[model samples]
Target chain A: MSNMQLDTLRRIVQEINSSVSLHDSLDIMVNQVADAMKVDVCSIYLLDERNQRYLLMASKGLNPESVGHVSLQLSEGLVGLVGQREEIVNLENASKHERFAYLPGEEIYNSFLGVPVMYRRKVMGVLVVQNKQPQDFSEAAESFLVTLCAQLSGVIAHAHAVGNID
Target chain B: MSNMQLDTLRRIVQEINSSVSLHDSLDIMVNQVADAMKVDVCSIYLLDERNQRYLLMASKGLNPESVGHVSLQLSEGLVGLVGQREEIVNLENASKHERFIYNSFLGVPVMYRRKVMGVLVVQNKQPQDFSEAAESFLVTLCAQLSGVIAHAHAVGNI
Candidate 1:
């Protein structure tokens, strides 16, 4: 799992170095993570710097229409919980958790893992994966996802700095 | 003279670092260069890599409507000559020369990492070439602008 994760990380870093547009880069991120982790769903939520709210930016296995349409306050859902605490959230039955808040087409997933994307100690976004099975993600899996989140942090920061993303 | 040129260079560098649109950055370059050198016409001609033609990207003293509408081939005008040779062209009564285009023309190639990116040119209607000091200053200024153009290319702005 770590090897697969490292390979995915290398691909994403290469994409960023190619200087592709921000949209294409994020698309690569969500799709690559989903395939590398063999997860049922993978998504990225970006924090709107001005509003301090997270907006669903990219996703796979969720409602395609929900991207850019789903917004959550810092205190809203499990995503918000991960961001607010600046830590990982792993749940076997996420829908049963009190912090679980379902957006469009999200109720089918039972297991969840969410990691905060941080840069320079600032939370830039959230990375999440979900599964239908009621099982916790493995320690290696969680660690691999965290590594991708760190890469995402730099990609997002570069996009913003270069005026490629608002 | 170097002090004023340095000030203009500093201001242009600041604008590029601000991540402004490439169009705005080029506009600042032409205007600031024209003002600093007191030239009648200052213009930038960028090479279109696919077609290998020079397109007038920004200018002062030339017709405002000519930008983006004026195109010169690598074999067509003095701008083309500068880019082709990757050298500075200083001429008095440039219109009388075989590659004559503008009168009293001074053009320099904007190169980045040894690749010719475009040409920076200034012109005057009078039949007198620019001073050696002015020519050297334009060369240095274009060298500074090369990095900004490279960034613009990376961002897909050019």
Candidate 2:
């Protein structure tokens, strides 16, 4: 996409693939995604299936203190659907989604793209990006984000299986 | 209630309440009422019967940003009563109908005819007294507050 440099994305993915700590890895992912795509907000929602929610573990433009503190209902909204469906949900006006949720301190964004991250047939989390202005995301941008799913989910899977990422 | 208190409350009822706007209204109300009552949580819920949802309109200890962002249906276990969604039920009882249905949260609802129009809800984070004097203020407050809640949404322009 004209919006991103292929080398930049590959480099970011390479680094993400090289991480062990869950927090540090996603912290890096959000920054890279935000800067490269010129996005207003980027968040990583790790699936907490046992609790029936998706916990927002990392974000850009959202309070870092909120990491792991906020839990989204796994059966409730778009974030929840991403946990169950494992499908790409892109919206031009996010609030209009039947599944949209309005968290009080959440960044108000109109354009949204959330893709499920998978590892070994298990959905690990969702990679989400939002823009302040209303617009549709391009296929190239979507693919780049999808590529990130592979790397981030791998890091997340280890955290989930080991019971050790904070 | 003093004519002055009623008059003050009169002005505090609008889409978000007078010049300050948005959360400022709820924000100010929670502070004002909490200082007056000194309870653990001072939460207000407003109902949209058509939508069948009761939105968190304001609060003191609860996350302020949570105001207007979270809601409940008439049957949800938290507030828990479709029929009981109005007037003067406090935390002393903490559940409903002695009903064992609604979570004993015992909330007070405001009504306009058969429908619940607004509510002032709270649950103790710990043991405390919700004084009769204080409880009296909110009961009357909900009725007046409900009138204003209707005033805000009935008009497109405030």
Candidate 3:
């Protein structure tokens, strides 16, 4: 990874680890990532084991009401593709992706970057950043996001433990 | 009014009227108002017109997970006081007031400019005297909020 990417990744990890509230931390993560990448939107989706679907947990730059409202099955769209494969998918032209499913009344995304959020070999969720303008994600950008995802996985695991006990 | 207060009031009104998503609007309204007022908690207790009970519409500094989990009658606590009287209630010493059921509460009847909207509450959970300046600020906030609620009502009828 480039030094710039490494620096950015380190900064994101430090911010998330230091956040006092888990909710605020997640909000900061997506907002900061969107700002750093100069992208239009960033979102984090957590898998609901009971329903076997992904629910949007946090988002930046998209309609706020969309959070907690949109749910997709395990193999529904681009989200399903990344979740099932446990791989990163970068679509410079999202419209060309065969699995892309457009929701009615929602903004159309031209570019997409998605990475599976995993913890100890288990896929926990999906993290994504998108731009309205069609553009390819750089290798450095992808690496930075993956590293950030790894840190997020640890945070999520700790949060879940606390939440369950409380 | 301080620039911050005006900006916050404007933002709250905009959010109420904007086509933005409901959750997002609530989040923005709470956070901006809380930050502007420098309060520990800022909350909106919306009256369920059908049920005649108060429901928390949004909150900052409390718990989001607790949203839609709590409700109260129109005749209970400080909220009930404002809801019944349909007038602004400023309490510097909340514990001493008969209507002030909560130990720590600074509440105002949210008037949609002319009509009472619901109740806007700020609480510290600890004893502290509310300044006159703070009370006036709360009134201003409520005035702006009431306008938005009135506009929303108008839109619903159309």
Candidate 4:
């Protein structure tokens, strides 16, 4: 990973280590990750175990109003596919995929990459990045996002343990 | 400010509002600032109140081994000059100045409200001074850093 990418990761780690408020850390994560990766959008979806659904908790690039108002079942769409597989779902044009499901303000994006945020083999959430233009992500770029999700899973798990998130 | 510059500022603000660990935030700041400004080095020296001195805490471009091992009194070099004056210290060729410190240097006082807490500096290998745009960027970044440092202190996270 590039130094800038590492810097972003370190920033997230620091936020978690310092016990920052959950919402602030997630907000910062989306903005910084979008900036670092040069992507049009970055967002996070945390699973609501009670309903077996994923909530759009934070994002940058898509409509801000869509946040917390959007969600999908564990079997719903691309976000759900990622959680189901507990793996990366990279697509050049998500609109062509059978599993693609459009959310408000997400139509402009064509490229999609979603990775499962997991802790001890249990999927906690999905971290997704999108671009208006369709292009394949390099290995390093993909690896960078995966690494970020790995770090974020702990934050989500901590939130659960502390009653900050359900 | 350019969009890229704005992104850097927002990133710093996000780091602070999110309450990142002080040391990691400073480390990330120097690296990002140096990368953004295209300068050879970026560093921060913060006050150690009890010792009445400034200690080199974080840097990118300077000798990494020097961090935590370097200290200067408030009256000592260009870094101190910024702290004492509570203003910017820009030198085309610091080596020629009576209070010369680095080669081609730009130093700004990291202040919270009206008080100085530390110094933020960038160095260039060439003898020529930094551009006005570059100076402006550093000044703005230092101002934000002041808030982070102060909050960290209050929370006993420094």
Candidate 5:
């Protein structure tokens, strides 16, 4: 990428890191990811250790009602499938995927990209982006997402630990 | 009670509520309880929905390493007994009570203060549970804690 793009990425990361708290950090992180990637929406679903389910923690450009209201088991939807394998899923035609359980609440999107947020060899969460136009995520985009995941993992682990103690 | 005590209690409530996130909220809540109650340690354990075990989530005055490492089923320890009964426990000589397995344990049920919300816990690590006056103080402190839990539930559900 050019210097301007790199500068933009750096600024986004810095702004997200400055969030006053974990919840604010997650909100800013998803918004920045969606803005940086020019995607229609971004959603982050964190793993619930107790139930072994993915709980939607934050999202943008989807139904607000769906936020924190929906959950998926380990292998339930396309997101779950990607999380189960701990793999990057780049689907140019998301509707074509057999595992794509349509959430009518979410906006229609032809392109879908999701990557697992892994920490200490454990999958902590999934970061996903969707767009109305058919396209693929560039290598640079994937690398930036990986960086974001690293920052998020620590925030999540700390939040879970502290929340339990109180 | 005195006006100063009421003022202090209000400040504690405000400080706990102003915490930016759940993590910070828990840390502040536990520490505030410990300070207000003059206890060695104050901690909270939440019941994991699937595992049916109380997992330590936040603690003060004890080992931080113990967080997330110690867990007990519903009837395993003094903590478990409090959870199972969902009652306020007061043991002057905790060691004498058969249910009081821990050498020192003082805890109260972190009731969601609501019918639907599950159990949350507040515990102190001392040779005995709080004295009668101290127990009343802890119960008052837990009532505020219940308010916090109710608020958190609203935020989570929203």
Candidate 6:
């Protein structure tokens, strides 16, 4: 993990950890992640425990209106492979992958990288970044995202464990 | 209802309306709304009917990680007020209300065909009140969100 964005990533995690209001922290974090990475898109999907599927929560690029509208099964797409396998997938041509389910105009996105976001050793979701120019992500950027994921799920686990939300 | 942001609301509804993915559209739409209104926060909370609580689904101007982490029953909080009454609750200084509840927040219901799908809310770090125009604008924006939800349900997108 040796990217220049580590400073920005630190800022993201710190903000997430200290956030009292849930809504602002999520949006600020997603937009900040995209800015720090200088990527075309940065999307985070959380698993809806009820359906056992990933629900889109936030994004920098792609369609914002598509956030709650898209859901991915563990058996579907590159994002799913990350969660199911708990591995990082960095591809120069994602469309060529066997599991690459095309999304029509999403053809412009060739370079893709997905990292499983885990909390308490459980894969809760996947954080993905894409580029149209087919560039590769740095090792540090991958580590940076994982750090964010830990904070993402830590408070959640803590809250759920306490059953304090409702 | 004729605000510039309201126009964007129309376009966003169609965008979410045609999208194949449910979560992505909702997050994206809320992001657009946050930007359009130039607010500090925006989040949509769904009634987790199966559990008798509201689930934080998507947000802009707030913590993305908190999605699904925060939940509230209809009997609690500002978000609960919006859903239970099916009315828009706007406060210039939300925290000042006797029911300012936990955090300084305000919201409007996402009403579709008279059914409240959820509550779409925005907040500031400090206490603040929203303009009448701002509140009315959110009312329209949330309506579009509910319409999208309703349409998605009809098309089996949910």
Evaluated against the true structure, the overall lDDT of model 2 is 0.61
Identify the CAPRI category of the predicted complex in candidate 6: incorrect
For residues B26-111, what per-residue lDDT tens digits would candidate 1 score against the true structure?
A: 89789878887777899998888799999999999899999999999999878899999988888877866698734688898987
lDDT of each: 0.72, 0.61, 0.66, 0.72, 0.64, 0.65
Error of 3 at B68 (Å): 48
lDDT string, candidate 5, A93-116, tens digits: 787863455332534788888878
Residue-by-residue lDDT tens digits, candidate 3, B39-104: 688888766667888778779977877666668787787888888787666665676777552346
* CAPRI classification of candidate 4: incorrect
Question: Model 5, range B1-158, lDDT digits (tens) per residue?
Answer: 23333334444544553455656767877887777766667788766647778888788866899977888887886777777787666664567678652345567776532221233344444455465545444444454444344445444621
Q: Pick the candidate with the highest DockQ.
A: 4
- Chain B TM-score for all candidates, comma-separated: 0.89, 0.69, 0.74, 0.87, 0.77, 0.81
What is the DockQ (computed on Cα atoms) for candidate 1? 0.02
- Give the residue spans of candidate 5 off by over 4 A: A98-106, B1-158
Model 2 Cα lDDT, one tens digit per residue, B1-158: 12332333332322122223324545665666665555567777776667877788888878768877988776764454633544455555453345332122435665432356666665554555565544444544453344344435543212
TM-score of each: 0.48, 0.47, 0.48, 0.49, 0.49, 0.47
In candidate 3 the C-alpha lDDT for residue A109 amounts to: 80
* Count of backbone collisions in candidate 1: 0
Interface RMSD of 3: 21.8
Per-residue lDDT tens digits of candidate 6, residues A1-166?
Answer: 2222433554465455446533454566678888877888888877767788888878788687888878888667778778788777888777576344533134478788887765434676777888877786665566556555544543443334444433
A58-139: candidate 4 lDDT, tens digit per residue: 9998788988988888887788888888778888777676344644342667788887776545788998898888868765
Off by over 4 Å in 2: A1-4, A98-107, A164-166, B1-158
Q: In model 2, how large is the Cα lDDT of residue B54? A: 76
Q: Evaluate residue A155 in candidate 1 and report its C-alpha lDDT on the 0 to 100 scale.
A: 55
**Residue A156 lDDT (model 1):** 67
Task: Identify the runs in model 6 with alpha carbons over 4 angstroms from their true place.
Answer: A1-4, A102-107, A159-166, B1-158
